[PDB]
Amino acid sequence: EGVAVLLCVVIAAWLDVDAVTRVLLISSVMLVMIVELLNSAIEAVVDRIGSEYHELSGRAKDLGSAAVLIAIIDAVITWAILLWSHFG
Amino acid sequence: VAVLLCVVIAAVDAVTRVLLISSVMLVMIVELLNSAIEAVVDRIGSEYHELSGRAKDLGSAAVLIAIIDAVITWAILLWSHFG
Amino acid sequence: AGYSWKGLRAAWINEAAFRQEGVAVLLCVVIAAWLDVDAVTRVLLISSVMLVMIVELLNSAIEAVVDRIGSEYHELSGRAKDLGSAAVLIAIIDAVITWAILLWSHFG
Numbered sequence: 174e175g176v177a178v179l180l181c182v183v184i185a186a187w188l189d190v191d192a193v194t195r196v197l198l199i200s201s202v203m204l205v206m207i208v209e210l211l212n213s214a215i216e217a218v219v220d221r222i223g224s225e226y227h228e229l230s231g232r233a234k235d236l237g238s239a240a241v242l243i244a245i246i247d248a249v250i251t252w253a254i255l256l257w258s259h260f261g
Numbered sequence: 262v263a264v265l266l267c268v269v270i271a272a273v274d275a276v277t278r279v280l281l282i283s284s285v286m287l288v289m290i291v292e293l294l295n296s297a298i299e300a301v302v303d304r305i306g307s308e309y310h311e312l313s314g315r316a317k318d319l320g321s322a323a324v325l326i327a328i329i330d331a332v333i334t335w336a337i338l339l340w341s342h343f344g
Numbered sequence: 345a346g347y348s349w350k351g352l353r354a355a356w357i358n359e360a361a362f363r364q365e366g367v368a369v370l371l372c373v374v375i376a377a378w379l380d381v382d383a384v385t386r387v388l389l390i391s392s393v394m395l396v397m398i399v400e401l402l403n404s405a406i407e408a409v410v411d412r413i414g415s416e417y418h419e420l421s422g423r424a425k426d427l428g429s430a431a432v433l434i435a436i437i438d439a440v441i442t443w444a445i446l447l448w449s450h451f452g
């Protein structure tokens with residue numbers, strides 16, 4: 174789970190790109206990790222609310238999962254744009 | 262909806278394009294995370310318990326900083342672009 | 345709904361960790377403005393530290409929700425805070441890595 178992201182970081186450290194590109198490649202996947210952690214925190218909050226009050230939290234989990242997906246899409250796009258301009 | 266507006270009018274060099282798009286997409290991400298927190302706080306039945314207005318303020322603040330960051334990003338880049 | 349400016353001030357007043365990170369952000373932004381770097385590099389130096397503030401605000405929002413329930417420890421409450429704190433940590437690590445790579449490539 175943190176392997177897949179750290180693996181990308183290693184690749185981004187190996188690719189013959191300039192410093193700016195490397196930062197963008199690395200930061201985009203670290204953002205995915207950040208949003209995944211925040212989403213899992215929200216999921217824990219939802220579960221905590223359910224445990225305490227026996228109440229659902231509406232679309233809280235769906236909204237958090239959508240945040241992760243967008244972060245992932247942002248990462249794919251970033252990598253595509255950069256690594257296609259770098260060579261295509 | 263005005264995000265996809267920003268994206269298509271960003272579509273300049275590749276690196277700059279990534280920065281313009283990403284700054285706006287970060288706003289989307291943060292807004293979704295803020296909306297998730299809101300869905301918990303304002304859930305059905307929340308009126309019967311202790312309610313964290315603080316949580317919603319903090320989440321809205323995160324959106325504000327994301328937006329401000331996006332403005333600073335576009336301003337610096339576009340000022341570099343023209344003039 | 346939430347009040348953003350009210351929220352910013354509340355985070356500052358109530359969270360010592362937010363003030364600590366906030367002053368670090370201000371220092372970095374001032375340095376970023378002072379440094380002789382191109383626009384792209386400047387944007388990255390600034391956005392990377394600003395992300396810490398964004399994530400800390402979200403983390404603090406998460407914390408406020410579970411704390412509102414009660415003071416007594418619950419495993420799910422601890423889990424939520426740990427995950428939120430890990431997110432902030434990764435944002436900070438990312439910021440330092442960004443600064444290290446960009447500054448060293450430009451000036452090293």
Ligand SMILES: CCCCCCC/C=C\CCCCCC(=O)OC[C@@H](O)CO
Nearest residue numbers: 352353354356357366367369370371397
């Ligand atoms: C000094 C600002 C730090 C720079 C980073 C960007 C913004 C992050 C946080 C700013 C909100 C702080 C506002 C609250 C404040 O300082 O009021 C004064 C308070 O300390 C005394 O009662």
Ligand SMILES: CCCCCCC/C=C\CCCCCC(=O)OC[C@@H](O)CO
Nearest residue numbers: 359360361362363364365366367368374
């Ligand atoms: C270039 C700066 C000069 C002008 C300063 C104007 C701003 C005045 C007050 C701003 C807020 C002070 C923040 C200090 C603070 O709370 O730090 C403590 C924190 O790091 C420890 O937990």
Ligand SMILES: CCCCCCC/C=C\CCCCCC(=O)OC[C@@H](O)CO
Nearest residue numbers: 371375377378379380381447450451452
């Ligand atoms: C809290 C401040 C700590 C500063 C430590 C000492 C740093 C001295 C020089 C910085 C490294 C080289 C950067 C060069 C540079 O961008 O110059 C700035 C610009 O104003 C000149 O054209």
Ligand SMILES: CCCCCCC/C=C\CCCCCC(=O)OC[C@@H](O)CO
Nearest residue numbers: 361429432433434436437440441444445
């Ligand atoms: C190419 C890599 C360059 C890296 C430069 C050296 C990095 C050394 C330390 C990195 C971590 C920075 C500080 C992280 C930290 O302790 O966070 C503080 C805590 O408040 C987090 O929640």
Ligand code: NA
Nearest residue numbers: 200201203204
């Ligand atoms: Na990032």
Ligand code: NA
Nearest residue numbers: 284330334391
């Ligand atoms: Na940005």
Ligand SMILES: [Zn+2]
Nearest residue numbers: 358359404407
């Ligand atoms: Zn706290």
